[PDB]
Design a protein around this ligand. Sequence first.
Ligand SMILES: NC(=O)c1cccc2cn(-c3ccc([C@@H]4CCCNC4)cc3)nc12
Length: 353
Amino acid sequence: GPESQLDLRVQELIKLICNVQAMEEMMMEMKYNTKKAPLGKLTVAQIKAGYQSLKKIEDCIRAGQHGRALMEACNEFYTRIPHDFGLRTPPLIRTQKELSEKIQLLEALGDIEIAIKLVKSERQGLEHPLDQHYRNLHCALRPLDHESYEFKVISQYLQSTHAPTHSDYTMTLLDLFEVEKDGEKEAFREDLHNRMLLWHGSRMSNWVGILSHGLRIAPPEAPITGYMFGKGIYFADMSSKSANYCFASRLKNTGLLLLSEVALGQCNELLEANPKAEGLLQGKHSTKGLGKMAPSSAHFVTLNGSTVPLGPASDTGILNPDGYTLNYNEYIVYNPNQVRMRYLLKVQFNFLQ
Ligand SMILES: NC(=O)c1cccc2cn(-c3ccc([C@@H]4CCCNC4)cc3)nc12
């Protein structure tokens, strides 16, 4: 029809996150039967039925049941959520990392179902499909100049916080956008102290659901498997730590990074893992996992009432005597009204191949 009234950089962003064909590739790479259960026919009830199937699996794992009880619970999940292993027999889910891989499948399906409900809208004719999907996002995306001051700071925050033990790749900032989701500033806890700009990475199929619904907490019917500090919204002060959760590949080496204003408040500092630190706050507002390396406060600056923890990072003198020590920090909030998305980064992953 008529011309797209959006900036070309926004057009490329809408092009990249609304690629349903790309979500099919990622789902096929996770052994999801896109033929028997098409993504266009995915409903919330189907994902909810799979969540209840994973809960029965989590009960068998925590009860040591590795016999028929687990075989039928896995077959129930593999039936409600169809898979495709060729002519192979589907494997048994019995470990935390195996269970975590299946929950990440369901979390991805929920974000694809949101994106698919967005692309299959109507009002075709007057508005370009690019503007149609951007308007249905209900979230502003404004490109920033490469010579602007914000671009220099986010670039320094990008590279100076790249972890040393993540030498598998380097990251190049391609584009930078300003994020203003509708209804997010009206619920943000502006009263809370310890306002910091923290990283967050996610898979490519989750950005339409993230930009449109914000960062959400797991539903109650989902198992607690995989949450080191309970169900919440996890952030990090190291850019590469969050960029690993983008799961960029050598064939698909372009992902997105989200910078949000997190109202941490009084931090509950933890060392050992605890999937119930939410009930351990008692007046506190956030749980902070202490790592071995973190940026020092000497290089900290402020960007619109929020502290940017720039690098380079140094040793924190933190060690877990009776357990495992995190390499870097983890910030967890237990309510979406403590998070306000601000920046979106178009990041190119230069893998060490
Ligand atoms: N996504 C991030 O940028 C991120 C930054 C810092 C610490 C993080 C911890 N997470 C995280 C925590 C839990 C999970 C899932 C939740 C359910 C599926 N199995 C594990 C996935 C990611 N994500 C983090």
